[PDB]
Design a protein around this nucleic acid. Sequence first.
RNA 1: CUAGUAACGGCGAGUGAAGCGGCAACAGCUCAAAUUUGAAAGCUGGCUUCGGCCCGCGUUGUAAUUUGGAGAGGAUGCUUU
Lengths: 96, 49, 137, 183, 463, 88, 39
Amino acid sequence: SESDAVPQQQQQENHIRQHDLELESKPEVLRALEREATRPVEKTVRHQSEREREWLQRLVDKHGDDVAAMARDRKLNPYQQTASDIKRRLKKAGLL
Amino acid sequence: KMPLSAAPEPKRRFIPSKNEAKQIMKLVRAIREGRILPYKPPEEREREE
Amino acid sequence: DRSNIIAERKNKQRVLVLSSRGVTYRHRHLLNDLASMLPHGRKDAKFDTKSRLYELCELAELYNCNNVLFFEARKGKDLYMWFSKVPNGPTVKFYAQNLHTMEELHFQGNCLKGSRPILSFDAAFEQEPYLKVIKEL
Amino acid sequence: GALKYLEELSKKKQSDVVRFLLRVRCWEYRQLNVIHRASRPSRPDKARRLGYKAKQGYVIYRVRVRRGGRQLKYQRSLRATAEERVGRRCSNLRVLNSYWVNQDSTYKYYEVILVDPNHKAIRRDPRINWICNPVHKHRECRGLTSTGKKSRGLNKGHRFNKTRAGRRKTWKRHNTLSLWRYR
Amino acid sequence: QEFSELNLSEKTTKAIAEMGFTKMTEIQRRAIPPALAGKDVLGAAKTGSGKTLAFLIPAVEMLSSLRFKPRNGTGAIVVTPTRELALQIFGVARELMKYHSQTYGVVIGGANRRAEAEKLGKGVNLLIATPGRLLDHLQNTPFVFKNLKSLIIDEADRILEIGFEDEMRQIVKILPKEDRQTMLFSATQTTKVEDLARISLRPGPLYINVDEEKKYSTVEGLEQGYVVVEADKRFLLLFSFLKKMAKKKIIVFFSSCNSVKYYSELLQYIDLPVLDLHGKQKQQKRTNTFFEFCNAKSGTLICTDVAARGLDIPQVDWIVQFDPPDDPRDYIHRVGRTARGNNGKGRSLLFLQPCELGFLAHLKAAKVPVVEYDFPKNKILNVQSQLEKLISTNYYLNQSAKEGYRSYIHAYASHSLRSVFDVHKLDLVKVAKSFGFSTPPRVDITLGRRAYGSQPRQGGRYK
Amino acid sequence: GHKTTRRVLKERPSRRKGAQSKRTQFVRSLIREVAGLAPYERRVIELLRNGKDKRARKFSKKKLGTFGRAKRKCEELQRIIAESRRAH
Amino acid sequence: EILEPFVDPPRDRNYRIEKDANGGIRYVYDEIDPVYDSD
RNA sequence: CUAGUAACGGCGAGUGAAGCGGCAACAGCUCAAAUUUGAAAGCUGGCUUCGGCCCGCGUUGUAAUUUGGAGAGGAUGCUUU
């Protein structure tokens, strides 16, 4: 049903993925192209620098898990980064 | 009595410099490759020469 | 007494002859030929179209005029004529259809400048109120 | 910062400060050479908005041009004459732009921003090295500066029907009898 | 009746469960089932019963049931008198739509007009607005409001008191009327409220009464203390007070939620322990904090006066009105009665600048006895240099100070008593020094003859 | 003619390419005081200080070319007169 | 002299008001005399 | 193709376009008006053991960011080298 007269509601299947699309008998070239486009690829997961790991380590050694206290800390967190960013960096480092 | 700009102040004016951080890391990479000479305090350079 | 009229009872009448921005050579020639017949008329040109219509009364107040004869031009082809009493009087909008100015070389006649003309009206200029208002303007 | 204020000042050229400064400078320029090197732009806001940079390879050249008619009017602008005279004196430079700086009873003074295409500071900069290409040799002689673009009628619209892509190319296109193979 | 009885959506049930609400008041229980049926509602509940959920549950249910999207514009519009009430309702709606894909937004006088225009253009499904700015956005900004199904008018007596009568007349004239459910609330019942209910609501209303009849607004058994303090020292005095009246119970009222958040972070850094109740936290956190303050021997709780209007104020030694009161009559009578207490008499102190002393003349007209409190200059703990260093070096505290300063200026500008509290008589440099600034940040305080020959327009279309 | 459902369009950032900005107004006012007046602006201001507004508008129109530009210049110089009297 | 203790105290024409032909509002301004100016 | 149409003209000689429509080819961008201001971070030359050292240009502005169907700053959580 169309409670609100919307021309786009039959078209459906505010941020979208930017660097790729999420797309969900025949000639052999077509099948080969699908096969080479569908084959699994590696990701080359970006690691962290030694100094960033040292910074996150020193940050854990004084507060442990209170990410709000680490954000408040001016000495050990000179760039006054938000606790969400530091929590994300800790999760990427595996230091929770 | 008030500033003309009501724009927010960028966070860069409250945190240490990032350009100098990049320059210092470039210098650290240069010292590690032995391309440039490390720091010696000036009295050492005076007694050496 | 700076009225510039010497008579028993003065008919203090002043006209402001004005043209719009997109007037043609024919409209400008008709403006020059018609304003030459009026001594109590002042000539100015290029009124701004985007400006409001009542600002014409302010332009007339500057030249102490109580009559405005406006030459509005549309598309560079169509001529509309506005006859208005300036402070609070009525306005008559007209469309001019066929123009033949004084520069046209087949007329073979000519008259003085400021000679008080005999204004020849039609018998329909009293048998209809709208033609009566046009007649008096 | 200050260039906004200088732009607003340049927009009042008969005010007391600007009139005084224009007269004193006109006196000095009148007693100098016709085409003389200017150390720095007298109007830095105007030069900066036209592409002048305080970098090696950028040169200002002030030039005086006799004003008036050539009743045959010269269809060439006085600003175009200025760029051409400077372009011949500095035949190794490329004319970037020019702008009005002063006017007298008998002369109109203009400053021409030029660029050296052989300097390495210009050849390495992707924002200006388009002028290093040989298709930009003597832009002032082919109507390729701002005055040239205005005088050739290179604008969009019905008012510029016969000149928007070149007047002589349009005339040659309209005067060509096209005969195809199957007629 | 509990919230699980009605067949709400599972997203709405989960959100209310997270708030911690399992039992209703009378106004929710008597308004939500008829309003979910599509009937227009005329109410007589006051601030603090729980009317916010009573008009937000049907709007959220309508927006979720019709599957609204950001390209559909506004579906429900909640009109509030003041900006802080609108922000409180915005916080409640943010808590209510935790699982709902629908959008929600606030439009209040005193904020960025262009940012609000972009926000409305992108699409705000539930719009909590202030009448003047709502009318301005309805008239001059392009945004979709053609799919309006719910108009809630909240606290209509105050809006008609401020002078938004003609604004609401043009608002009701502009807004679509067909298949629109109207819910109007007012604590009183005047002729202007009746006129508004007649133009807005349909011929058949439903009139619901949740109001106490024993209002004890006696004008003799009261005593309101005041302290005259200049702007640039105001907070310092409060800080000194809040360090000298330790081991006591103090409630402090601020004008805005942003200033409460700023002063909470400020007192966290300047080693003075407080408890905070502002509308940027979870409802559960706020209820637990108020419960902890209610069952403590000492301590101080800082909150907004409109946020604690609907709050069971416990026995406290001091009730401090640091900012100008939003409702001066309600403040004096009811807050003085809750400050005096059931037992041994607490005191109600009001902070007055030496430009709002005409309030005392008002206290002379109402025949309310006053008490003047003076303070020695040498007993003020001067932490101004530390405060300015903290504001200049900490980016988060600088942002909070700017937001609190802007909120204070805007709430002072939008004041009912403009004669007593006028923004034009305020020294912005001194009040920004009170907030901890060397220079006052830029704010907008504000936010003959007819033409010759001009007769009134009689035709044509203007958009 | 044909019936289509009109959309509400996104606000154009090219709209009002003049200045509603307070900083440009500040710069324009400061430069006016620093630079001074043109000779014709001084003649218009000496007519406006004597109450001869009709002559001032005619002089401005003659030396500017349009009645709208004359009106704008006369309002600007009258505003300058008002703030000069307020400072006096 | 304030009467209600907690409320705010309550707080060169060139045209003439004349009824127009239709029955709305008509404005009558000062008439223009055609006297020639000194300029 | 429009179209020898509109328009202009001792309205004679004549002069004489353009929008739309079909096609060929298609591709978008760079600056000026901002304070990097917690760090001129930019560049031409000369000397070289070629790795990094000096003089100079430049704050009257060289890098980065931004170019109005935009953008910035914060917050935010994904996605990219």
